[PDB]
Design a binder for this molecule. Sequence first.
Ligand SMILES: O=C(NCc1nc(-c2ccc(C(F)(F)F)cc2)cs1)[C@H]1CCCN(C(=O)CO[C@H]2CCCNC2)C1
Lengths: 216, 216, 213, 211, 211, 206, 230, 195, 195
Amino acid sequence: TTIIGIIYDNGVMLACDSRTSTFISNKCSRKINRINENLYVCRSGASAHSQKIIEIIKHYCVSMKNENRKKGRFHVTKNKYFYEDKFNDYNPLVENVAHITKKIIYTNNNFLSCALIFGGYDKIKKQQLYAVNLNGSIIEKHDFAVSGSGSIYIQSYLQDKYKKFMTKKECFNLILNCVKYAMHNDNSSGGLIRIVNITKSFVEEFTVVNTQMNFQ
Amino acid sequence: TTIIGIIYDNGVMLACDSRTSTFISNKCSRKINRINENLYVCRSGASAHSQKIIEIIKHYCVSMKNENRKKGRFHVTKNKYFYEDKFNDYNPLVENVAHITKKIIYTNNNFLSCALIFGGYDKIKKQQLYAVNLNGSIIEKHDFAVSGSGSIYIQSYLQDKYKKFMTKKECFNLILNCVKYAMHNDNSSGGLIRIVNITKSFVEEFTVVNTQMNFQ
Amino acid sequence: KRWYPYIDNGGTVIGLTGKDYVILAADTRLSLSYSIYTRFCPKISKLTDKCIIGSSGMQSDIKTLHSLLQKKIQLFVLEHSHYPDIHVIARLLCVILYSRRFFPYYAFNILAGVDENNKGVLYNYDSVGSYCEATHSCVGSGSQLILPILDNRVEQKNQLIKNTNFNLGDDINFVKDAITSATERDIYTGDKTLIYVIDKMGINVNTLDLKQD
Amino acid sequence: TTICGLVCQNAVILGADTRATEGPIVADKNCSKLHYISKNIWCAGAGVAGDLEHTTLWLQHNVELHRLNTNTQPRVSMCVSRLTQELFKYQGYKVCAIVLGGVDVNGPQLYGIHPHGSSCLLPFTALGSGSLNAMAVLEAKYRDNMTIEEGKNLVCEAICAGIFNDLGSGGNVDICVITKDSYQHIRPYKEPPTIYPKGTTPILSEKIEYI
Amino acid sequence: TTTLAFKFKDGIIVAVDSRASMGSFISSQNVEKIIEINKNILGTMAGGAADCLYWEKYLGKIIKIYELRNNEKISVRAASTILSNILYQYKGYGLCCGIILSGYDHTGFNMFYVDDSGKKVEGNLFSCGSGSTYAYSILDSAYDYNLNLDQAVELARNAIYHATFRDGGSGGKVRVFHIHKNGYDKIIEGEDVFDLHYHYTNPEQKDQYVM
Amino acid sequence: SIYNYNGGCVLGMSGSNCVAIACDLRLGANTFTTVSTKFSKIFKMNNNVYVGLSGLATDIQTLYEILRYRVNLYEVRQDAEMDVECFANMLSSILYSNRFSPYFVNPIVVGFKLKVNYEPYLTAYDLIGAKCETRDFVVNGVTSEQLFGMCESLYVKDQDENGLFETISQCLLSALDRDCISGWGAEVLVLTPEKIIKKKLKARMD
Amino acid sequence: TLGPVVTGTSVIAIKYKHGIMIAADRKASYGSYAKFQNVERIFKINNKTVMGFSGELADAQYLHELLTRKNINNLSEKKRKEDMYTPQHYHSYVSRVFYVRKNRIDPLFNNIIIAGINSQKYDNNDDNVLLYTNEEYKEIHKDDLYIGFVDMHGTNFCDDYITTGYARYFALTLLRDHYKDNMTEEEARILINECLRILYFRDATSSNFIQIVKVTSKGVEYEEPYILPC
Amino acid sequence: MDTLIGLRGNNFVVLAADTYSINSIIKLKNDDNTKFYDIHGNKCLLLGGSIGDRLQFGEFIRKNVHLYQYQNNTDMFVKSFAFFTRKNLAYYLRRNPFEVNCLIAGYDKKDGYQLYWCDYLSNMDSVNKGAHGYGAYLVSAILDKYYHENLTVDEALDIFKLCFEELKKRFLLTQINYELRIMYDNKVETQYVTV
Amino acid sequence: MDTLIGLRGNNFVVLAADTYSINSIIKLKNDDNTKFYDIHGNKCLLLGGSIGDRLQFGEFIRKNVHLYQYQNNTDMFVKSFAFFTRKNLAYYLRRNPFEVNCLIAGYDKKDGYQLYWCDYLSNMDSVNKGAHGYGAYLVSAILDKYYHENLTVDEALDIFKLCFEELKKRFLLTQINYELRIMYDNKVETQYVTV
Ligand SMILES: O=C(NCc1nc(-c2ccc(C(F)(F)F)cc2)cs1)[C@H]1CCCN(C(=O)CO[C@H]2CCCNC2)C1
């Protein structure tokens, strides 16, 4: 598995492979999960454990979103969605969802073996990446986060190529090349590349078919 | 440990860190070992096992070199040595030394846990890199070889930056940056960087003090 | 993890004596766990013109043991200038199997033959060399299925009304029915069976297709 | 066991063999492995015999209860959620590898559920000992849009490959074609002694009791 | 397995069952568990059939060489000592033998119990195998030195029968041999113990016998 | 190895308008000591429902008591005999209720389904209630392989009561003669819609 | 060798009308790490015999060295082309090596294919052998062609087609379904490419970078390695 | 180590046991009285195994059956007593097992004289004869040989004498002292046999 | 399980052992003769432990001491015999140990009557009294209590009678049959004591 998040100038891009399990049980999977319209999360580790964590945290996020509503009136294939909550009035903060996920993982860290990368946008802290580690420790990353077996192979490479205020285009190219290199080097990662770009007012999800060409 | 070899135009560079062993027993070590004037080898894995392998293979190399002699007459701090055997009349081939090392490792691969990178020059195959893996399998690398704990962190990076016919200068820069990134990411590798440039007629040995600077 | 040096390649070998003949039928499937290496690997090897050996267990051990017994029989013929009968070959097989008592051949064997006096003879062997003569026997994966059937047909112990008159053709058809039942109920038995008949004229081989699932 | 499922246009096709084994011994030559969950949802099981049967009965009757209460057609994703939550409730035990195939308002949906409680929506899949043999045929021959008859043929080929290549698979081919309107469960889809004399058995005693 | 031997007024009686098993499965019921070591010595089998058979034939070879060299019949004591030393040399390699060597020599009738652990015990009455305790109980209840040959043979048959009745490891046929001064006789070559139950304990055969 | 402590085996077979169940009568101890020769493993639940329980004897008795309790409550509540298929499903549910601490038993259920038409009904179980229904025969116990071989070779479809009795008795006896830890008598029940024939075979006692 | 470290994946060998076609991807994996991606896993034994391996690379290289010296010693004693060792001879030799190592509990962690042409009656390539330097293909009867399998336990056999590793499930199903006698080179290539395509999609240790080797009347020919089309 | 023996005829039942109390390698007593548990109404529970488990289970069963008989003012049937004992032993089997072996003897008018053999796994059955302990291996065949349905009580005691003599002669534990319960003719009698 | 007892006075040495041969739960013999190994020249090796190891080590040491005495035409001293036995037992301790316990008794003119206690680990010492086996735990204190230096042989035999009676009464294996070697006044005597 390879899961990557990169903050650029006007958003945060998450990316993942699609391979699941020497025998490949599945080659078209969804490791990036939509928790809310402004909040996605990437999985790595045990599959059932992470998936039930996703369901529990979707339940928590729905409860928080319903409770956040105030009374009264106020104010390469892509798929794009505009936020229903235009002003971020009641969408939960990314920190809140990431921290309750950290709490649930830490409380059950005897057997849970899951590493998550939350990415999202809110009006307080703008775009954010949070990395929830295996034992249930949370670290906010302001440049990028990486996790999974393949990510190690690209660590220095990402550290060489990251810039502070990348545009959408060059960040997209960087994250795509990163997942491609990780798939090239790691047997456990492969298949089509899924990318999710999260911005102030919309989210667009890309699907990419890939090939690694080199004459090194 | 990080050990790297890169073939460039009319030469082959090898490079290594200096850190030995959470507690650092030694911070100025020699993982690159001179087997012959035209042949060096990089160690990784268990220290005593690899060092005794180096001693045994130095004995084999000396025996082979003495036997190779025909009768009669024929025909940033650096240290440079010119080959005594100018015409490569009797220096052992790099393939021969690498293969007898593979034989010794494979014969004792129950307990031996050592991965080696031989680099050298001879008149038959010019510059060569050989990688002797843990169980005693030998693979000749015509572009580069990497081994040790830190090398994984640079696997894509080197794969992105290698060119087929690099000059001395850019190959030196690439191998230095590779070991620097590996040391930055890997706790088990650190300290001063040793580099050995092997060419047709001489060997240079560089020592480098290092520092990783980034505003990523 | 230590490497375990034994594997069961499966399949069944049935043996049945007559008055002056003996039948040995073996399936030809070769399997590893729930997969099939090949659908044709004979388990029965000729030893003399009146003696054969079938075996079930590890195919490498079976092949090596059969070749070893053949080589020692040829050596016996060259040295002592007469073909050994089934009893001599039987004691020889016992000694050979017991010589590896602490790392035995992973094989259970049936030695079938017609002796000097024109009597059908069948010895059965476990791995370490304990052996005994029998009028009917079975080894391999299907043996626990087929040994009750052979007991019921041959001995008829629990039958007051006994039909103890058998000839060669009925025995052949009964052995076919037995290996068919083993194929039906044993996963490792199937594909094809080679049926050897030894009698006065010598050895005769016949084939019967079995289910391939 | 060899079980397979695929998604064709407005339909799911499940298929299975009919062999149950007590280790090396074939314990049942005509076992039925395609299980009813609802009119528009079916499933097949490839794990601990008991756990699969009782989990399928529990899922079927709980789905019927949900249908009665809500009056809506059942959803495949509901069955997936219930199965995965139940399987994760136990720490990996109660092993059930399920292919769950149905049609609802969202379309035809095929899911592979693992014994640890992980689900995966798939266009086709296979499970059991002969899963790899079936997946060879499916990966060779599957295409995205197929007729029902073509999907039936491909399912039959996959199950036959499992039957003939995997020792733990055998017997007949079962299939089930699930659509929104109804289902067609074709159980016998494809199919690739002595009488003793009276009184021969000795007895010590006999007792006759009239019902 | 059950073997027994006892000394009496007219020599030695030896008796055995004929069952061989592999765990729970009965591999055979025609096993010959009494071996002619020489013309005057018999040896029983209990435990590992391979080891017992091989080393008793090996002992026969050694005895043949000894008798041919010395022009004299070996004693039962010397044969037992040779067997015990041979079996002790393989201590720790998992040999499993329990053997009763009984015979006639120049010092009269002799009987020795020898097992794989180097044991060597001289006596007048022994029993070995899984049913040994039952045969011991029957023999010790009824043993007398002055039994006639028919009485001794019947006692041995009854002891083997009760051992086979109680022990799952023993069964098949009972054999009873009689060693005398000029060789041995097979008094009961083989008798199916099925008939012995319906002789001794259930002669009338109107109902299942209740233990 | 828990099933080897007592041993035991149960068999069932179907004929035309008739069915039969059979079992050995041994109670063993520590896999080799026979301690009883009348321990019947067949139990009547009702006239059209019989169960054959093989395995650990304590669990045989406990499960039989539970099943008798449940069947009697069902029949007194409903004032009718329990259907054989309802009993089989109930036995599956009871065995699965103890999934992580199972009764070490391998039951068979043999009876008549009523439709008056009397259809034979046979099914075999594992210890956690996974059941397989069969039209021809069912087997459980440590002697399962020998019983499977005998029934596969000798089963004849649609036999009358006498032929069914002879075939099932010969299958059971031949299978038991090759098993150390089962035997010591054999009970054979043959049910027809009007009556039951209980017989005790002249079996080996080895 | 205690266990596998650097491993080669499946090998697929089949008989076709002009001889043997044997295929393997050029990848050797260090666990889940695809460290080496241009490795050779089909070795030439002689002009009518090739060897392929799945499993540990060190053991396979040791076996390759053994067979190399066996071929050289055979060549030293040769006086006519019939004296050259056949593929079945090498199969028996490899089976014996594996059997002895199994007996001493020091196995080679490999599954080996030994394939080639048994008959000398199709060419004069062995009359003048060249080890250090390299008309239409003749139709060869399948009885004169040989493909043989060996495993860790020494279980050895032969067939018209052989698979190792993950190909024993994916490739072998399609082979048993679709194989036919006397296929042309194009049909054999298409079948092998389909099998390798399924393996590339379903075997995580595989790659789409294939090496094909043909044993025909004109000897052993190593095809240029290629990426799987489409 | 605790040898128990039981023999049932048409007109009697007899139970017997060694009278040794064992603590590691020492016999605490040669006249142990923690094995027999006589219940009111022609019933006896003879227990083997660990002394503490014997005391706990035997007194538990005795106090339960006495409570039944006083609450209901009747004598519990021997079959009900035996199956109640088996049910309670099996209840504790999967929760803190009583490592005790049981012979359950009694007399009823409904079913006559009755003997039940039951092991530490609660595997129970009615028997005409039975034994428990290692010494069972040395006595059972004797009980098989000399038993017949129409035995007198004196002939049964002679059979028990044969069993005791064989346990002295052949068994590793040379058990010399024995206690016997004789139930016959609506009386329960105690006997002590040395050698 | 093989009880061995030894008692040395100024004018005698006495050894004793139970005469039981054991094979799992059955006593093969109540008159076992595989424990005592009398050597020529007023010497005795009384061995415990497994019967096969007893036979091998006993016979071995006996044929080794007889070879010495015939080669040299003298009687080996008892001290030399005891230390030779200990040396050979310790030689095999780290290579296939003989699991045998030894009492080594004898008479010399050089050193009078001598008794040596030696265990399966070849830990040896000269003693006035000693014991081996589990039964040692029940006899040693008796040997401590009633021993004095000027015992007559009859008083020593009375002490051994007390030891045998205690082994009958209290020991779990009710050992009844015993054999005794009495070395005194230049004669070696065998006695058999029941109870
Ligand atoms: O008893 C069986 N047949 C009849 C045979 N009787 C014997 C035999 C009997 C008695 C004696 C002796 F005492 F008188 F000397 C010596 C030999 C060997 S064979 C089968 C019963 C089921 C198990 N079985 C198998 O073959 C299972 O397959 C094996 C193959 C390789 C290893 N893994 C499983 C044998």
